Design a protein around this ligand. Structure first.
Ligand SMILES: CO[C@@H]1[C@H](O)[C@H](n2cnc3c(=O)nc(N)[nH]c32)O[C@H]1COP(=O)(O)OP(=O)(O)OP(=O)(O)O
Ligand SMILES: [Zn+2]
Ligand SMILES: [Zn+2]
Ligand SMILES: [Zn+2]
Lengths: 44, 67, 49, 257, 48
RNA sequence: UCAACCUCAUCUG
């Protein structure tokens, strides 16, 4: 999938079985990024 | 965290009055006089503005996850 | 004034703004029920928790 | 054996408030009219939210809650709009709902106050009572809020978001003459605004044959419905409830026969 | 039912595996009960 | 058609 970097906030695409290191910053904490499917919230 | 829309007890909209409350406090108005100027009459509505702690400003200091 | 009938409550009632706290204990975390569920290996009796 | 003929005298009428007096009426009727003010007057408010992107500090359901609480002008078309359950079409359509959109991004350095003004409605008659503004969220630079919302007809019995009124002040017997409230020390008690007593007299003399009448109302509008039309719609809705009850009662009596 | 000689231990009863279950983790490993380890110690000393 | 045991600490009436 596409993981957003923890520090430089740049999306990087990491394949499976690949080390979790952002290109151009090297930070080792990525975030999965919001899903395309949309969830309905009742305003209640 | 942010000023609630509508007073809990009655439901009068108090969400539009926080920025005006802060501005009137900056002017010189006492908290009670500012609350009176904003039109808050019942102590239920005055509790909303008087006791509100605006943490959204502290949370906005942290950088966003996605830029 | 009584909400259901509108009649004034005879005894005047103490009302005021008091600070209340919501404790972490909530019923949704505590409700539990069991019916022929999982069973321990050693005792072969219903599990714990 | 028949209903009394009530009388209304409107003392104050302002865009935010209606102060009126109903005389020659029962306490039950008056209380239930107030009750219908609060809970059974239809209004328009957001009940469906779909957030495409929310990078704000507040989570998605927090934003949805605040959006639901925002009042929406419902003066005329709330009577025209149908309930979603009644509407034949699946989900929501122009007849059963009103669509709003929010697309705000804080490109500038200064904090962007997302307000109710940023909500844009597909139908001009419903607007978020903007004509300050209700603050939905504050956006730091690089934070964005995008959402689509649908607002439906409903009354406050479902959810307090559909309350058309802020505070309904109801008072009867301003000077205690029916002794419905028995003061332990009458003198310590402040006089009512509607009180006709002299300052020396704390309470009116007990009236043994009296009945609660001459009820005083102060109905404050939330801005969605005009304060006059809140009262009119409440009376009409109570009358409609009674007529539906009578129709079902007649059908069941015929069935029993 | 009970002779005094029978009190002295000449034959040690080894409880069934039901008494001493093997605690399985993820299929990767099988820990053994404390009784199994103690019986292993007893068997080692007896063989020695 | 379906997941470990110990241990300790923290809370609950
Ligand atoms: C009234 O007696 C009860 C019971 O005996 C049972 N109980 C509670 N703790 C224990 C415990 O440690 N061990 C055992 N065996 N039983 C226990 O709890 C007792 C009271 O305790 P409390 O005095 O705090 O009750 P408040 O007076 O405080 O009630 P508030 O106003 O908060 O509702
Ligand atoms: Zn990075
Ligand atoms: Zn209030
Ligand atoms: Zn429809």
């Amino acid at each position: 999938m596409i993981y957003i970097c923890g520090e430089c906030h740049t999306e990087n695409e990491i394949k499976s079985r690949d080390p979790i290191r952002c290109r151009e910053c090297g930070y080792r904490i990525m975030y999965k990024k919001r899903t395309k499917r949309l969830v309905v919230f009742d305003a209640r | 965290m942010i000023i609630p829309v509508r007073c809990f007890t009655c439901g009068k909209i108090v969400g539009n009055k926080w920025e005006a409350y802060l501005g009137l406090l900056q002017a010189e108005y006492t908290e009670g006089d500012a609350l009176d100027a904003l039109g808050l009459k019942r102590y239920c509505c005055r509790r909303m503005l008087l006791a509100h702690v605006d943490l959204i400003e502290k949370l906005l200091n942290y950088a966003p996850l996605e830029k | 004034y009584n909400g259901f009938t509108g009649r004034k409550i005879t005894s005047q009632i103490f009302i005021g703004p008091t600070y209340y706290q919501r404790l972490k204990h909530m019923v949704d975390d505590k409700i539990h029920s069991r019916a022929r569920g999982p069973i321990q290996i050693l005792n072969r009796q219903p599990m714990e928790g | 054996p028949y209903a009394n003929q009530p009388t209304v005298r409107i003392t104050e009428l302002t865009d935010e408030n209606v102060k009126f007096i109903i005389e020659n009426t029962d306490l039950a009727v008056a209380n239930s009219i107030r009750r219908v003010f609060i809970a059974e007057v239809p209004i328009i408010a957001i009940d469906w939210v779909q957030i495409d992107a929310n990078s704000s500090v507040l989570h998605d359901e927090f934003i949805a809650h605040r959006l639901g609480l925002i009042p929406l002008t419902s003066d005329d078309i709330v009577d025209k709009l149908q309930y979603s359950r009644d509407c034949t079409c699946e989900e929501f359509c122009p007849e059963c709902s009103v669509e709003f959109t929010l697309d705000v991004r804080c490109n500038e350095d200064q904090t962007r106050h997302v307000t109710s003004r940023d909500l844009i409605s597909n139908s001009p008659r419903v607007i978020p009572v903007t004509s300050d503004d209700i603050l939905i969220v504050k956006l730091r630079k690089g934070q964005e809020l995008r959402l689509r919302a649908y607002a439906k007809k409903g009354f406050g019995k479902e959810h307090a978001k559909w309350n058309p009124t802020a505070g309904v002040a109801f008072e009867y017997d301003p000077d205690n003459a029916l002794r419905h409230t028995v003061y332990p020390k009458p003198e310590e008690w402040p006089k009512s605004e509607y009180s006709e007593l002299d300052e020396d007299e704390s309470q009116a003399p007990y009236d043994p044959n009296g009945k609660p009448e001459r009820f005083y109302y102060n109905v404050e509008s939330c801005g969605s419905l005009r304060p006059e039309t809140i009262v009119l719609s409440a009376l009409s809705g109570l009358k409609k409830k009674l007529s539906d009850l009578q129709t079902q009662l007649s059908h069941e009596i015929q069935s029993d026969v | 039912y009970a002779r005094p000689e029978w009190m002295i231990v000449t034959v040690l009863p080894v409880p069934p595996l039901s008494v001493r279950p093997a605690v399985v983790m993820q299929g990767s490993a099988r820990n053994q009960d404390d009784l199994t380890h103690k019986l292993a110690d007893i068997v080692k000393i007896n063989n020695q």
